Amino acid sequence: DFKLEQVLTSREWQSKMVSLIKTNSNRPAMGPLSRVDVTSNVKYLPNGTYLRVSIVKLFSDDNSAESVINISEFGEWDISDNYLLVTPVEFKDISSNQSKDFTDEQLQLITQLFKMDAQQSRRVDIVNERTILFTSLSHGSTVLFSNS
Amino acid sequence: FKPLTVVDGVAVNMPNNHPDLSNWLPSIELCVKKYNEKHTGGLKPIEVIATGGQNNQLTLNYIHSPEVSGENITLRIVANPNDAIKVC
């Protein structure tokens, strides 16, 4: 049954996600946000622990990242059938802001919202020998890939 | 997975037992075609996997062949379906 465990543990896993937000007119406590790029790297250890680092870039009008958040994570993980059950233990955020578009409170909110998605359990679907898909109960998903 | 649609000869799939994504389709068709313009031949996706819908949020996961699966990416649209067409 640990087939899924052999896949997650055999490799380090990486992803990119771009979120494009034209419902920006429905939340000013996120500010002038138009786009979010997230790059992530994760290893699931056979310990039952994982570690994750994510670079979040926030965009307003500039094709320049107005703000970059580095989120580092550690926690427990477990499997039940197709479901990967995570349990974060520490979330570290370090921010950099080279812009007046985004306030401290907006970056803090966006950090809390990425913390809310990182905490969730997810169905694991094997897409190919290098690729897996993670799906949340809220039907949001992410595709992860592995180099070697 | 189960089929939703096909666009430029790329299969757009969705999970088994997934909700009705048909209310998104024009936006999916457009966001796949606008992606293919940057991703020809070996860069062209072998499939796209859609998820989401619930709570005004669509997710498209682009799957490239396993030789070059380092190009795999998730595009998430945070727009109501009427806005979503303008986002791509």
Numbering used by the authors:
A (entry chain B): 26 to 173
B (entry chain A): 206 to 293
Could you share sentences copied from the article?
ToxRSp crystal structure was determined by molecular replacement using an AlphaFold model as template. ToxRp in the complex has an αß fold which is formed by an α-helix flanked by an anti-parallel hairpin and a three-stranded anti-parallel ß-sheet, followed by a C-terminal helix. ToxSp forms a lipocalin-like fold consisting of an eight-stranded ß-barrel stabilized by intermolecular H-bond network and flanked by two α-helices located at the openings of the barrel. However, ToxSp ß8 contacts only the first three residues of nine residues long ToxSp ß1. ToxRp ß5 is positioned into this gap and forms main chain H-bonds with remaining ToxSp ß1 residues. The residue Arg281 located in ToxRp ß5 forms an intermolecular salt bridge with Asp142 of ToxSp α2, which restricts the opening of the barrel. When bound to ToxSp, the unstructured region of the C-terminus of ToxRp performs a disorder to order transition, by forming two additional structural elements: short α helix 2 and ß strand 5. The newly formed short α helix 2 contacts the turn between ToxSp ß1 and ß2, as well as residues Leu45ToxSp and Ile46ToxSp located at the C-terminal part of ToxSp ß1 thus increasing the interaction interface and further stabilizing the fold. L33 forms central hydrophobic interactions with apolar residues of ToxSp ß strands stabilizing the core of the barrel. The ToxRS complex exposes a bile binding pocket inside ToxS lipocalin-like barrel that is only properly built via stabilization by newly formed structural elements of ToxR.
ToxR is a transmembrane transcription factor involved in the regulation of numerous genes, not only virulence associated, and can function as an activator, co-activator and repressor. ToxS is built of a periplasmic, a transmembrane and a short cytoplasmic region. The periplasmic domain of ToxS (ToxSp) interacts with the periplasmic domain of ToxR (ToxRp) forming a stable heterodimer thereby protecting ToxR from periplasmic proteolysis and enhancing its activity. Located at the inner membrane, ToxR and ToxS react to environmental stimuli like bile acid, thereby inducing survival strategies for example bile resistance and virulence regulation.
